[PDB]
Design a protein around this nucleic acid. Structure first.
Ligand SMILES: Nc1nc2c(ncn2[C@@H]2O[C@H](COP(=O)(O)OP(=O)(O)CP(=O)(O)O)[C@@H](O)[C@H]2O)c(=O)[nH]1
Ligand code: MET
Ligand SMILES: [Mg+2]
Ligand SMILES: [Mg+2]
Lengths: 470, 110, 23
RNA sequence: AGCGCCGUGGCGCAGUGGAAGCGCGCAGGGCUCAUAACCCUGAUGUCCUCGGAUCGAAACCGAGCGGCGCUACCA
């Protein structure tokens, strides 16, 4: 007799609803597994990598249930530029009787804290063990800047390989090596095509996968069959996420910082402009804790060119009006998660792909912007992502002076020009300004086959500073 | 129409003729395409595409077009080519369609 | 180690075989 | 989601303030010994659906339906 919405509301109320975060909790006592932190904010960012026409948004919605938009009326089916966003709350069943593999379950953002166990015969609830944010990375040969920026943001990885297609996929190796660049070993390999794969052919494909990942830094990466259309084998993914991936070191003494990947203009059309909202910076906090109503500034900010050819950088000052997590308004920010900081920044400033991978620092801290950067780069022997028909896969050339190369400094995608080349170090001149705070591991890509190709990793060791104009 | 008609044989067989069946090599076929030099292409009801000559007593005596049922005599020495011998005027073709001497997958109706 | 892979793949195959006899 | 466009008789179009339109199709007839060309006559609607004024509505307008294009996926 009762409607299904009434049933869901009753379960939500019995499940504890969504407890509201305290206005000023004791910050030094909070951990990424605390109830006030875990109930409304994710703590681990898990990225998805895979070839095009393989299925990652389908896998994401199978795991989390939050769909990726796949927008712009022309990027709906082919590729996506901006990373996808998804949210899954990991739950475990307390009862010892039910088997461990199906104890875990990833539930949507609006799921209750203690929802009922959907398994027939088990009257138990669910315990929220971890909150994770699932982000889709673009696996396309030209789509590397966004992919590398996401990999920088990511704390865990999921590689997707199609069993029925060719066993060695060079774009998968590209993404795996890019993840190896940025010091991330928590990778869970997943086979997308298990429904349409034979008994011995699947074993051969798994053996080939094990053969491929032998010399790479990642060694004990778990490998798990999953389904994207039948939407099975999700609980094992939750178990492996909980076990193989521990909490990255991220606590409260570090200075507050933000790395914005995407920007949104909050202005609903049709309704009169009298009721509008400011500008949203979609950023991950790799370090620091934020609250409601803080004072921040985007260090690279506005880029302008004078009549004399000088690059002026304006730090975009902004008061944080609010911070939005996946579900509702929060009062404090847990480090290591993607958050939409809705500030007084112009919605016009957050209109296009403008605030794509830019660093933001709170007032009382001075990240340093640079024009010429003294970098230390390491290359690989062979280019990854090239499909050669059985003859000596592409060989990496040493970088030449006065060559335009795409450098992803943690989040900033800049076209650097080589000033000089040394045995292991180089000088890069940037027309687009970029910052440096502590390390900001750098991904290097070269234009060889008409598109950006990853060549190796690099680290900033020095830079020619520029003093921003207030 | 024209003054040609009075020069003709005046062979008026308007009444319903008795249709002729297939005899030891004579087989039914369907005109697929019209070619030049008084020659046609006939898809026979055996999965083959034979080249059928527009033949004597038939050249300028009856006028035949695309998609016409036809009776054609083969040649044992050369199977590829054959000769159109008789033409059925779309009425007894229906009768053969019900009796099904030809596969019914070849449906040609006005 | 690929030990957790084999059991999960076998469970997947059993589920597909039972739910979809046409395959 | 908003805004711009539209609402065949089979298709492309036209006037929309005075009531069924043209052309191209289709059917029949005519010219020609014969065909095409050409000429003549039709047989097809809810000029999308619900209302307001009006001798009059399809228009003029509004209380909506459906399809296209710009903003563009508008946390
Ligand atoms: N039959 C079958 N189809 C699958 C499976 N997994 C994914 N797909 C197909 O993937 C297609 C698109 O998935 P999607 O995740 O959106 O593409 P994508 O991999 O993100 C594109 P990019 O790699 O550039 O990001 C779906 O239509 C789906 O049919 C699978 O396991 N079986
Ligand atoms: C940039 S992702 C930010 C998520 C937030 N819940 C909004 O949307
Ligand atoms: Mg996606
Ligand atoms: Mg006579």
């Amino acid at each position: 007799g009762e409607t299904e919405e009434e049933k869901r509301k009753r379960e939500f109320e019995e499940g504890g609803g969504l407890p509201e975060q305290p206005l000023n909790p004791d910050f030094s006592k909070l951990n990424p597994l605390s109830a006030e932190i875990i109930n409304r904010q994710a703590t681990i960012n898990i990225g998805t990598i895979g070839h095009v026409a393989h299925g990652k948004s389908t896998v994401v919605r199978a795991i989390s249930g939050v769909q990726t938009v796949r927008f712009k009326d022309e990027l709906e089916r082919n590729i996506t530029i901006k990373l996808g966003y998804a949210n899954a709350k990991i739950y475990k069943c307390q009862e010892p009787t039910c088997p461990e593999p199906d104890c875990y379950r990833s539930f949507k953002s609006d799921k209750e804290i203690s929802p009922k166990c959907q398994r027939p015969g088990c009257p138990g609830r669910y315990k929220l063990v971890r909150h994770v944010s699932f982000v889709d990375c673009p696996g396309h040969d030209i789509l590397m800047s966004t992919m590398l920026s996401g990999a920088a943001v990511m704390d865990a990885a999921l590689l997707l390989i199609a069993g029925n297609e060719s066993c060695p996929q060079p774009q998968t190796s590209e993404h795996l090596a890019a993840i190896e660049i940025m010091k991330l070993k928590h990778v869970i390999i997943l086979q997308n095509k298990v429904d349409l794969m034979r008994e011995e052919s699947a074993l051969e494909h798994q053996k080939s996968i094990l053969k491929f990942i032998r010399g790479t830094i990642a060694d004990g990466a778990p490998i798990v069959p999953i389904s994207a259309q039948l939407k099975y084998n999700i609980d094992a993914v939750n178990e492996f996420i909980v076990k193989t991936i521990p909490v990255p070191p991220r606590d409260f003494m570090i200075s507050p910082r933000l790395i914005v990947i995407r920007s949104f203009d909050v202005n609903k059309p049709g309704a009169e402009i009298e009721d509008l909202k400011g500008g949203v910076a979609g950023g991950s906090i790799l370090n620091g804790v934020f609250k409601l109503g803080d004072e921040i500034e985007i260090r690279p900010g506005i880029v302008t060119k004078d009549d004399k050819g000088k690059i002026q950088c304006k730090p975009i000052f902004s008061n944080i009006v609010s911070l939005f997590a996946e579900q509702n308004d929060l009062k404090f920010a847990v480090p290591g998660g993607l958050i939409g900081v809705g500030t007084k920044v112009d919605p016009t400033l957050c209109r296009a792909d403008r605030l794509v991978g830019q660093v933001v620092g709170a007032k009382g801290h001075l990240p340093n912007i640079y024009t010429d950067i003294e970098i230390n780069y390491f290359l690989l022997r062979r280019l990854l992502g090239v499909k050669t028909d059985g003859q000596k896969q592409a060989k990496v050339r040493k970088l030449e002076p006065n060559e335009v190369l795409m450098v992803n400094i943690g989040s900033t995608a800049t076209g650097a020009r080589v000033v000089a080349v040394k045995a292991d170090m180089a000088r890069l001149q940037l027309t687009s300004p970029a910052c440096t705070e502590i390390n900001e591991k750098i991904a290097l890509s070269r234009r060889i086959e008409k598109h950006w190709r990853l060549i190796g990793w690099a680290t900033i060791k020095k830079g020619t500073t520029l003093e921003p104009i207030a | 129409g024209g003054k040609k008609g009075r020069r003709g044989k005046n062979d008026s067989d308007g009444p319903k003729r008795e249709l002729i069946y297939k005899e030891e090599g004579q087989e039914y076929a369907q005109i697929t395409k019209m070619l030049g030099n008084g020659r046609v292409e006939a898809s026979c009801f055996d999965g083959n595409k034979r080249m059928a000559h527009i033949r004597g007593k038939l050249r300028k005596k009856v006028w035949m077009g695309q998609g016409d049922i036809i009776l054609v005599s083969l040649r044992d020495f050369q199977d590829d080519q054959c000769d159109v011998v008789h033409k059925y005027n779309l009425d007894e073709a229906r009768t053969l369609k019900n009796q099904g001497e030809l596969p019914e997958n070849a449906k040609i109706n006005e | 180690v690929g030990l957790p892979y084999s059991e999960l793949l076998s469970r997947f195959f059993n589920i597909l075989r039972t739910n979809n006899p046409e395959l």
